[PDB]
Amino acid sequence: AEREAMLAKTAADNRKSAEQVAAAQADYEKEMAEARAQASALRDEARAAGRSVVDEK
Amino acid sequence: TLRELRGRIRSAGSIKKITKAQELIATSRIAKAQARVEAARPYAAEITNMLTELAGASALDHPLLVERKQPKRAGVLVVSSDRGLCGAYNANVLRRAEELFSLLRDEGKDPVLYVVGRKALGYFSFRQRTVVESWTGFSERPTYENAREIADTLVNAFMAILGVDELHIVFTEFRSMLSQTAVARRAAPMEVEYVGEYSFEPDPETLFDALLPRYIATRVYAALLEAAASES
Amino acid sequence: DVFYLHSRLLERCAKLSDELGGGSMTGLPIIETKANDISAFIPTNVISITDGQCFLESDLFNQGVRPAINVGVSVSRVGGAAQIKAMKEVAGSLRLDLSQYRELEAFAAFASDLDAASKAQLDRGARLVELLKQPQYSPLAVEEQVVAIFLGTQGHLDSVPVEDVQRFESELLEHVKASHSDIFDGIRETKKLSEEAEEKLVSVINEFKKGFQASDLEKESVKVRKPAP
Amino acid sequence: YRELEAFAAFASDLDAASKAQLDRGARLVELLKQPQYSPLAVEEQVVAIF
Amino acid sequence: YRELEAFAAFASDLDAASKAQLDRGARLVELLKQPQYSPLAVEEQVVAIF
Amino acid sequence: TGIKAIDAMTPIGRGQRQLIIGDRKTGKTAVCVDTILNQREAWLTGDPKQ
Amino acid sequence: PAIVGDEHYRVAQEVIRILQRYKDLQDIIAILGIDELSEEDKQLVNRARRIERFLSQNMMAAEQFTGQPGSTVPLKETIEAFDKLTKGEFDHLPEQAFFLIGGLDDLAKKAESL
Amino acid sequence: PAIVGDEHYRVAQEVIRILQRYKDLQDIIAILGIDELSEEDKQLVNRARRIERFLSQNMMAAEQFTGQPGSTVPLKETIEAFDKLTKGEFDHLPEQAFFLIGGLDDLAKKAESL
Amino acid sequence: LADADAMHAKALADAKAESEKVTEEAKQDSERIAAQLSEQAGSEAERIK
Numbered sequence: 001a002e003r004e005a006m007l008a009k010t011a012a013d014n015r016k017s018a019e020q021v022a023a024a025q026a027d028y029e030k031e032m033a034e035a036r037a038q039a040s041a042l043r044d045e046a047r048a049a050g051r052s053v054v055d056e057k
Numbered sequence: 058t059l060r061e062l063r064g065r066i067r068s069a070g071s072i073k074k075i076t077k078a079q080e081l082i083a084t085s086r087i088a089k090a091q092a093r094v095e096a097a098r099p100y101a102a103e104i105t106n107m108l109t110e111l112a113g114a115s116a117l118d119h120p121l122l123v124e125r126k127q128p129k130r131a132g133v134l135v136v137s138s139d140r141g142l143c144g145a146y147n148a149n150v151l152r153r154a155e156e157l158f159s160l161l162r163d164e165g166k167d168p169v170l171y172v173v174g175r176k177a178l179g180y181f182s183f184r185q186r187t188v189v190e191s192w193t194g195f196s197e198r199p200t201y202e203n204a205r206e207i208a209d210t211l212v213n214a215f216m217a218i219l220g221v222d223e224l225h226i227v228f229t230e231f232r233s234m235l236s237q238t239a240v241a242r243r244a245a246p247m248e249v250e251y252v253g254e255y256s257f258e259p260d261p262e263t264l265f266d267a268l269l270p271r272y273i274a275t276r277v278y279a280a281l282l283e284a285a286a287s288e289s
Numbered sequence: 290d291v292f293y294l295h296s297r298l299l300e301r302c303a304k305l306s307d308e309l310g311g312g313s314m315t316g317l318p319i320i321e322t323k324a325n326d327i328s329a330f331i332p333t334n335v336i337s338i339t340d341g342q343c344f345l346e347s348d349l350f351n352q353g354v355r356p357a358i359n360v361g362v363s364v365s366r367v368g369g370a371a372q373i374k375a376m377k378e379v380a381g382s383l384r385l386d387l388s389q390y391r392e393l394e395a396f397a398a399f400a401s402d403l404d405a406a407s408k409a410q411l412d413r414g415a416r417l418v419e420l421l422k423q424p425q426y427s428p429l430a431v432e433e434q435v436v437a438i439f440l441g442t443q444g445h446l447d448s449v450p451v452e453d454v455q456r457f458e459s460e461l462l463e464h465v466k467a468s469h470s471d472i473f474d475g476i477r478e479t480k481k482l483s484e485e486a487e488e489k490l491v492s493v494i495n496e497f498k499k500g501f502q503a504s505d506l507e508k509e510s511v512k513v514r515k516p517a518p
Numbered sequence: 519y520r521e522l523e524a525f526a527a528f529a530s531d532l533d534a535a536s537k538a539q540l541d542r543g544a545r546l547v548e549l550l551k552q553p554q555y556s557p558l559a560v561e562e563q564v565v566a567i568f
Numbered sequence: 569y570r571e572l573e574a575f576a577a578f579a580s581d582l583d584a585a586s587k588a589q590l591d592r593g594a595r596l597v598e599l600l601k602q603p604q605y606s607p608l609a610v611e612e613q614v615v616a617i618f
Numbered sequence: 619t620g621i622k623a624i625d626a627m628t629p630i631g632r633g634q635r636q637l638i639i640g641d642r643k644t645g646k647t648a649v650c651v652d653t654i655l656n657q658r659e660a661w662l663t664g665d666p667k668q
Numbered sequence: 669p670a671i672v673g674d675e676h677y678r679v680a681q682e683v684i685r686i687l688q689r690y691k692d693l694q695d696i697i698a699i700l701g702i703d704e705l706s707e708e709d710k711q712l713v714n715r716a717r718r719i720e721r722f723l724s725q726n727m728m729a730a731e732q733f734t735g736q737p738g739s740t741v742p743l744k745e746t747i748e749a750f751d752k753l754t755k756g757e758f759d760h761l762p763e764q765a766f767f768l769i770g771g772l773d774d775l776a777k778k779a780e781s782l
Numbered sequence: 783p784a785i786v787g788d789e790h791y792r793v794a795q796e797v798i799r800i801l802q803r804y805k806d807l808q809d810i811i812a813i814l815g816i817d818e819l820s821e822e823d824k825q826l827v828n829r830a831r832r833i834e835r836f837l838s839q840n841m842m843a844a845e846q847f848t849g850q851p852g853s854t855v856p857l858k859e860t861i862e863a864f865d866k867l868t869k870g871e872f873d874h875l876p877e878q879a880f881f882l883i884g885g886l887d888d889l890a891k892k893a894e895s896l
Numbered sequence: 897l898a899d900a901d902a903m904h905a906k907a908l909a910d911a912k913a914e915s916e917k918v919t920e921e922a923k924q925d926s927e928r929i930a931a932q933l934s935e936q937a938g939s940e941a942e943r944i945k
């Protein structure tokens with residue numbers, strides 16, 4: 001039963017090792033993309049404020 | 058203006074020549090493809106007959122005859138031309154393929170695509186629908202090797218990787234030289250139909266197992282010839 | 290003598306020699322061609338009288354090419370002599386490249402597959418065309434123009450998707466103007482892209498591209514020869 | 519030949535007689551070619567067309 | 569009908585509605601046919617069009 | 619000119635003649651008026667050579 | 669854009685672009701038909717036909733000819749409708765629905781009729 | 783052929799024939815497409831495009847048009863280059879390799895650059 | 897599996913650091929673009945005056 005469980009573990013874990021490497025890569029990419037999107041939104045808001053002050057002046 | 062009109066006249070005359078030439082050559086290839094359909098029919102008839110005999114001497118437990126317990130994935134083989142100038146042929150085939158996709162979705166199965174022909178491949182690439190595998194370069198003049206390969210791939214996808222619990226073939230039949238309707242057929246799992254009121258070597262069950270893939274290959278081949286005649 | 294009318298008028302536009310004060314008169318005659326026919330009489334007269342032509346085509350104007358310069362027909366016989374060294378370097382062959390792109394696009398309209406070189410040429414040309422689009426009453430200083438054409442000619446737009454190219458230019462030209470004005474000042478004062486300035490501009494473009502958001506029935510049945518299951 | 523020239527691309531699908539006509543014409547057209555300042559006496563023309 | 573006939577001249581098959589349109593038009597056109605020097609009084613025209 | 623297309627592909631130099639030619643409502647007057655407007659920065663220098 | 673607004677100008681320019689592309693494709697449409705175009709161009713031509721027909725309207729002065737009363741479409745509704753048309757939100761409706769229709773609500777009415 | 787030599791004349795006439803066939807085929811290509819041509823005609827179209835672009839040259843007086851300096855192509859080199867083009871020894875190079883290029887050495891340099 | 901979990905933790909930490917750096921750079925940008933647009937506003941107002 002113990003060999004059985006060891007087998008189970010190895011299998012699943014090597015599966016979760018691959019899954020966690022993929023998750024690290026994907027989460028890094030997704031968080032970087034979210035940061036870039038937030039930066040783009042901030043710059044768009046800055047340009048909107050610039051245009052608004054230009055129109056006000 | 059007159060120079061442009063003369064040039065347009067010359068271009069239109071050249072296009073007329075090319076189109077008439079291809080009309081006549083298309084008539085020739087229609088004749089040839091219909092001749093090949095007729096030539097292939099007797100083999101299909103006889104293999105169907107001995108498949109019925111084997112089924113009558115078989116338990117009918119082969120995977121390709123039993124619907125999966127909970128089918129969630131279904132493959133679709135869309136047969137299309139590899140060159141244009143065929144009018145609505147590809148459009149009709151892919152419209153029927155999309156209708157089949159909608160029917161499958163209403164049945165809870167997401168379709169997974171196999172495509173024969175370049176035009177359907179481009180059509181699906183435009184809409185970003187993944188195609189597991191595609192074959193091109195023979196829709197005008199298919200051989201049995203191509204159909205055998207397609208059937209082997211579909212059968213392997215059915216037996217299985219994630220695999221598919223079911224598989225359809227969408228193709229344009231040739232009912233008459235005036236009418237070419239797109240149809241969809243379920244090629245696996247094959248239902249069993251009872252008609253009404255032999256020795257085997259080495260046994261009828263192994264023969265049935267070896268023959269069902271052959272029958273699927275033969276039907277895929279017949280569909281390819283029908284598609285070629287319809288395309289012409 | 291209508292030709293002698295337009296010639297007598299336009300030929301007085303000249304760059305006078307230093308002995309006559311070194312003045313100049315630049316003529317931008319405007320001609321309205323009927324039905325997009327550049328082969329008419331007066332149009333051809335004025336074309337032969339002038340030093341270059343900008344053929345604005347309605348089809349291009351409707352397609353999105355504003356202003357609608359038919360690159361193929363248009364030409365400036367002064368060419369590089371009427372450009373600062375920077376733009377002469379970053380845009381030396383731009384017109385011929387765009388004309389070749391238009392020819393390829395017309396030819397490759399129905400090609401099922403294309404060589405990698407032809408596909409790359411089409412992509413570069415589309416990005417250049419989008420780069421050359423410009424809204425009315427939105428002038429760009431010469432330094433901004435050389436940076437914009439630098440984005441396209443040098444292949445820095447190759448990665449940017451076509452539909453976003455127009456924005457990628459604008460935003461970038463803002464960023465530089467807001468953060469790396471030294472490039473613009475160098476171009477304006479020296480009239481050329483120094484190697485150091487070119488490297489700095491490439492670095493700015495590559496760091497900016499990081500933070501840029503691109504918009505991107507019947508059944509086959511086995512017949513069994515018996516009456517019931 | 520001038521009517522069948524559109525089938526130079528698909529000759530393989532042509533009837534044998536049509537292919538023969540196309541091949542004959544593609545050679546008659548060459549037969550009628552002639553270099554400059556090299557007129558042929560009538561007998562030579564007869565033999566050439568033969 | 570004048571355009572539906574052109575469409576059907578090359579359409580592989582027609583829906584029931586298109587078939588009905590074609591069959592009605594092919595009879596309306598025949599109805600509007602009229603021999604020379606045979607004018608119809610307005611009453612007969614309205615009956616025929618009915 | 620202030621227009622990327624003209625200054626990059628068909629540059630206009632001081633002393634030469636650039637025919638803006640096109641159909642109605644193509645942007646000829648827009649191009650010329652933009653050229654005139656683009657000279658304000660040069661004008662404000664106060665330098666007759668610019 | 670400084671007069672009619674950014675949205676109006678954008679929708680007008682996109683409609684003009686689609687119609688110009690359709691006109692440019694006429695040379696092939698006349699001979700080979702819609703079937704032989706690229707898929708992007710096929711979709712463009714479909715929505716171009718729908719746009720071309722939606723620009724049609726049932727005018728009051730046309731009543732004396734058609735009997736159907738005329739219709740008025742305010743600017744905001746026109747801009748919204750043509751924005752949707754260009755974006756492809758009505759590519760599933762038949763082309764016959766856009767003849768002489770004048771409006772989004774009445775467009776839906778005729779589509780339901782068909 | 784009695785003046786420029788049969789070698790020059792044959793290449794010139796082959797180039798003229800290829801370009802005339804390409805001109806005739808341009809009507810089909812623009813509408814039907816390139817893949818619908820004969821294999822021989824398709825290969826001839828490739829040769830013809832390359833020949834048209836090789837007939838272009840970076841001229842000395844056109845440095846202002848292109849910026850790059852001009853070139854002088856000897857007559858024998860021209861004959862050899864166009865003989866090869868008509869025979870297909872340069873069919874594998876991209877089209878742009880032949881554009882505004884003054885001779886075979888410059889053609890090879892541009893091909894390696896692309 | 898331990899190394900992959902450590903890799904995921906490192907990826908999350910580096911993602912947080914990179915997001916902070918990107919936000920700082922974007923804030924500096926936003927500030928500079930705002931300053932440039934304010935200068936443009938002043939120039940336009942003085943031209944109109």
Ligand SMILES: Nc1ncnc2c1ncn2[C@@H]1O[C@H](COP(=O)(O)OP(=O)(O)OP(=O)(O)O)[C@@H](O)[C@H]1O
Pocket residue numbers: 321355356423424425640641642643644645646647648649
């Ligand atoms: N680059 C551009 N971007 C956007 N709109 C433009 C551009 N150039 C011109 N337009 C607009 O297109 C139309 C062209 O008007 P314009 O007077 O410039 O053209 P034109 O060819 O001189 O016409 P006309 O012969 O009637 O005087 C106007 O609506 C103008 O606002």
Ligand SMILES: [Mg+2]
Pocket residue numbers: 646647648
């Ligand atoms: Mg004007």
